[PDB]
Amino acid sequence: AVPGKVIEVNGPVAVVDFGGVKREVRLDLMPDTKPGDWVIVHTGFAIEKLDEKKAMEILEAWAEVEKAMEGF
Amino acid sequence: EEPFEAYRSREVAMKLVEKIREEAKTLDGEIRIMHVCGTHEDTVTRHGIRSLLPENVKVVSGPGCPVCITPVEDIVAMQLIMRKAREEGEEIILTTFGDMYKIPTPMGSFADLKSEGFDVRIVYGIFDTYRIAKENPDKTVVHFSPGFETTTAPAAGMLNVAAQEELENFKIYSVHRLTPPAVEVLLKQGTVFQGLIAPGHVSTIIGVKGWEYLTEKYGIPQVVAGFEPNDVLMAILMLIRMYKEGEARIINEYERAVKYEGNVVAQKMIDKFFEVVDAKWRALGVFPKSGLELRKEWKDFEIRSFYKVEVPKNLPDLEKGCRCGAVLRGLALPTDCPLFGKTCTPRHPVGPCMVSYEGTCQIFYKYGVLF
Numbered sequence A: 001a002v003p004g005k006v007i008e009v010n011g012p013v014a015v016v017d018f019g020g021v022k023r024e025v026r027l028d029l030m031p032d033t034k035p036g037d038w039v040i041v042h043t044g045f046a047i048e049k050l051d052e053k054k055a056m057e058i059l060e061a062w063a064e065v066e067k068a069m070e071g072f
Numbered sequence B: 001e002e003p004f005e006a007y008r009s010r011e012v013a014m015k016l017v018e019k020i021r022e023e024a025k026t027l028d029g030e031i032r033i034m035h036v037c038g039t040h041e042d043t044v045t046r047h048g049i050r051s052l053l054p055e056n057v058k059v060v061s062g063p064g065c066p067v068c069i070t071p072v073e074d075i076v077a078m079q080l081i082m083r084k085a086r087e088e089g090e091e092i093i094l095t096t097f098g099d100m101y102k103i104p105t106p107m108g109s110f111a112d113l114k115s116e117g118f119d120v121r122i123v124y125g126i127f128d129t130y131r132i133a134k135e136n137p138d139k140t141v142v143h144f145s146p147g148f149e150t151t152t153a154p155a156a157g158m159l160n161v162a163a164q165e166e167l168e169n170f171k172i173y174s175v176h177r178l179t180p181p182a183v184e185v186l187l188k189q190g191t192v193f194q195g196l197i198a199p200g201h202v203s204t205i206i207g208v209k210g211w212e213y214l215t216e217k218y219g220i221p222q223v224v225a226g227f228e229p230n231d232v233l234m235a236i237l238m239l240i241r242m243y244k245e246g247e248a249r250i251i252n253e254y255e256r257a258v259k260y261e262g263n264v265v266a267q268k269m270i271d272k273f274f275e276v277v278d279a280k281w282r283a284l285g286v287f288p289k290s291g292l293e294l295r296k297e298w299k300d301f302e303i304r305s306f307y308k309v310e311v312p313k314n315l316p317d318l319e320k321g322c323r324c325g326a327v328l329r330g331l332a333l334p335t336d337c338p339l340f341g342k343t344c345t346p347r348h349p350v351g352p353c354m355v356s357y358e359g360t361c362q363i364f365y366k367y368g369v370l371f
């Protein structure tokens, strides 16, 4: 199970790049998918997005609260 | 470069393994952790995680293999429908996943159906079946559809598109299954585990919300986990701490891919076309409210709505000697099977657990586990 980068979006179909291999993926379960998005694909369908930016933000937010509650 | 490198760093895996060991030292007894996902078992066996773990920490493999548990009755039934269709002049194109294609039954497999002259095509997803239906209006195209929530969602989506366009030569033989109800049953029938590694991809669909009742009702700690070895190692570490601190909650270690609410679009699509029913689980028995069938309003999308066949009674779920039932229940590993690696191999398999891509037996064989 490898993630892919959306390089093309045309209606309910996207072109996803998995390590240099590009395949067409159905977007019915992730309608707001757009070029640049990183998605998890299962049996030809994108089932969820991967946002490292978001994840890093939540982490930093959490650290900031703990750092502040502890004394730094 | 794929985002989230930290989750696949070997150096991180080493620290996690070391951390797990420390926590285990101060563990009073033995902790038994179960997962119900073939992809998790693949990660675990491929990276030798069971070896890296303390003696008092065991990883049990549940029934996380949708093809393995597809009942024999349904496979044979699909075969009889293919024969009856031809006899009645209607020609059918049958699609199936690669492993289901070779799944054995006491009366033959879909591969045998092929060799007898039927159009049986191997596909990677329901969208393939769809195109095939498009390209062959003169033929009834049916996909033998097995799968847990992650595979049922794309089926639901495709059915939605077909119903809009009113495609009429696009059917499916529904043998979809639900995962949580199976965990509940295993819990009640004797499989002992103190913590659960909830399936990451299934959780993408049903969310953390879909697993919460198991914790509220049985007080068992859970961790929704991804599929990188660090995801699993992290989940194991977290389950140990919760077990030691006497906590009973669900932690979403796979936060980056799983929303608490899950995928609502997918959920509604599934609820629109499918309804929950009691269902059989090959080699395990009948699990209440664990299967999916098309609602009456959509009977026309189920191939069985068009052909009544009678499957011979008393077909055994497994060949004599196969312990796939014990393996699926987490009560035994493939190495605890006398046939494993001798009589039974991917090449000449005895049970479904060895044929399936997600099968624990195939996974053990593939990675040279001789144990």
Ligand code: SF4
Pocket: B321, B322, B323, B324, B325, B327, B334, B337, B338, B339, B340, B341, B344, B345, B349, B350, B351, B352, B353, B354, B355, B361
């Ligand atoms: S090795 Fe074969 S025969 Fe033993 S349980 Fe696994 S599939 Fe069944």
